Structures are given as C-alpha cells and as structure tokens.
C-alpha cells in the first residue's frame, strides 16, 4: 500500500519561509517520481508547486518552491508567503516509472504565517 507522510503543523519564518519534509513508502522501488504541493480550502484545491525528478539525482523546479531529494523523502521549502497564505498544504507524490503507477496523497500540513 502507498502512504505519504507530512508534518501536522509548521510555523513560517519571519521572512516568509516554511520548510517541511515529505516522506513516502512505495511498495515498489520506483525511479521517476512526481511531487505536487497542493492547497486545500473547503471542497476546492489549488496547485502550489509541481516537480518531476529521477531517483537520487537533484530536484527540478514551480518557481515559488525549492527542495532536496535525500532518499525516499523530499525536503520541500516554500517561500514568498503572505499572512493571507495560512492554510492546508497537501503533499502529493506520484510514482511514475517503473510500473505499476502509484498515487500518494498526504493528510495535509497546516502552514501558519504571522
């Protein structure tokens, strides 16, 4: 079974930087994987970030985001935040190759900006 695990709460930096590790468990040992940071609010959902990367090799970046890949976790750093950006941020890992395709959606991270 596919499980994605992100922290419950992160407070944001005085400058506007929130950082959180996003760990996943593949039943396979997949190589091409695609991470998406999502924002939830009511039934709606909005794209914040999206990255595709291959294995151990570096993360490729939506400009608002940066990160690192250190094994089977991804250190997603969001910046350029306003007080208005406080909400629920979902980690979405997709394992793309080799087969089978697996989809993983997290429980969400509450980011606070004050």
């Amino acid at each position, epitope marked *: *079974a*596919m*499980h994605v695990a992100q922290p419950a709460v992160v407070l944001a930096s005085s400058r506007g930087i929130a950082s959180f590790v996003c760990e996943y468990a593949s039943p396979g040992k997949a190589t091409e994987v*695609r991470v998406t940071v999502l924002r939830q609010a009511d039934s709606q959902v909005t794209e914040v970030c999206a990255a*595709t990367y291959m294995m151990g090799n570096e993360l490729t970046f939506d400009s608002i985001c940066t990160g690192t890949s250190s094994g089977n976790q991804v250190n997603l750093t969001i910046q350029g935040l306003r007080a208005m950006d406080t909400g629920l941020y979902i980690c979405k890992v997709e394992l793309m190759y080799p087969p089978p*395709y*697996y*989809l993983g*959606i997290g429980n969400g991270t509450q980011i606070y900006v004050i």
Partner: antibody
Amino acid sequence: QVQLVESGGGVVQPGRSLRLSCAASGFTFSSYTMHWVRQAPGKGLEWVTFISYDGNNKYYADSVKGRFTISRDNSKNTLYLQMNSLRAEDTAIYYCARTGWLGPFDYWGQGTLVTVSS
Amino acid sequence: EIVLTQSPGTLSLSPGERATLSCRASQSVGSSYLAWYQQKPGQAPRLLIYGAFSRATGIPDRFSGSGSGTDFTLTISRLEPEDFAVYYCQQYGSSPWTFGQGTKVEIKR
C-alpha cells in the same frame, strides 16, 4: 468552463487502424493528466490507457498493450488514441476522461462509438 | 490487478427508499483512493464520490460514501427518480485503474 469533445469514431475492418481525438476546453490542459476508458455494448467500464502531464509517461491496459498508443499535443489542447490492430472485441464507446487533482476521473468526454467489423 | 466486486447486481427499490450499494476489493485500497460513478444509459459516467467519502462538486447531500480497506459502501439516503441508474465503484490509487461491474438500481413496482 470544463469541456471534453471527442471525435472521429466510426467503423473499421479488423486489422486496420483508427485514431481518436479528444479536444479540451476551459482548463489549462497542460496541468491535468488524462485517460481513455471504453464501454463494450451492455458491459461495464474498462480503463484503456493513461497519459502523463507532459506525455513522458504512458500506461496501457493489458488487453490493448502493444496495439494502442496514447499521445498529447499540448499547445493544440488535444488528446489522441492511436488504435492499431483492431479486433471485433475492441468495439465499444470510447470515453476520454480527465484525472482530478486528487485522482478520480472528474470530467468525461461525450462518447464515441467505434465498430470493428468486416 | 485489484479486482472490484460489487453486490448485488440489481437493487429493486421504490422511490423514497434507502439504497445501500456495496463494493469489495481483491486487496486493500490505498488510503481510500476509491471513487463512485453514476451512469444513466446513453450518457457518460459522472463522478459522485471520491476519496471513499467526499462528494463531487454539485452532487446532492443524499449521496454518501463509507468504508475503508477492502470494503466500501455507497448510500443514497432517499431515492429520487433521477437516482435510478447504474453505479460503478473504482479504485484509482494504482495502475491498472479498475472499476467494478456496476450495480444497476431499478424502480420496484
């Protein structure tokens, strides 16, 4: 305004090929991943094929593997299905569908009947 | 290949009555990456429920989803005349995407 209009169904003799098209509207198509799903007359829903956001990754149902290709012209906002060595059992209504943000098939095409007989 | 078996084939319920549709999987289904669809014949499927229990935009209150692991239920709390249709459960957490054979729901007279 979300719309998926598919076209170019019809009749094919067995062995010969046929390419289906689905044209997307009022969402930034580039951003959402796509599928095809057929429905044999009076039978259930069968997933046929999946295409990545870019097209760098493609997945096919066992029963079409080797014979069908999925592709996308992003700037034309169009999804395609090349079908190659059509069998009589490939006769179905072919649905184009969009994968939701969080995984389900949220929007569907209208349907396009492909008949494979000599 | 995660197989999905829905039961029964046919629910025979009068309008107003509750309808309870079952979907059971060959193995456990992710973190509830399981959908429900509706199909009124000669029309495309329409998404009803995703994430086992969350309702699709513009689907009315009467539709209701439950379950976890290999067991999932769709509840229609009262059958209105537009609800008499064919329903498919689907898993979408891993490839191949698979549907169940569908439960048809007919008018009982």
